[PDB]
From Swiss-Prot:
Protein family per UniProt: Belongs to the RNA polymerase beta' chain family.
Quaternary structure and interacting proteins, as annotated: The RNAP catalytic core consists of 2 alpha, 1 beta, 1 beta' and 1 omega subunit. When a sigma factor is associated with the core the holoenzyme is formed, which can initiate transcription.
Induction of its expression: 6-fold repressed by starvation.
Protein name, entry field: DNA-directed RNA polymerase subunit beta'
Organism taxonomic ancestry: Bacteria, Bacillati, Actinomycetota, Actinomycetes, Mycobacteriales
Amino acid sequence: GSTEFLPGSLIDRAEFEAENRRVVAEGGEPAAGRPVLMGITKASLATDS
């Protein structure tokens, strides 16, 4: 919608819920998301550093 996200990506739950609460509080749009399961190499190669 209007949450500044690319549909198909993998984002953290904390950031996702923070963005969903921030956006609806001012403009209003809920993004969609289903839980996912990853490996131990894709979780290690997708860190924030």
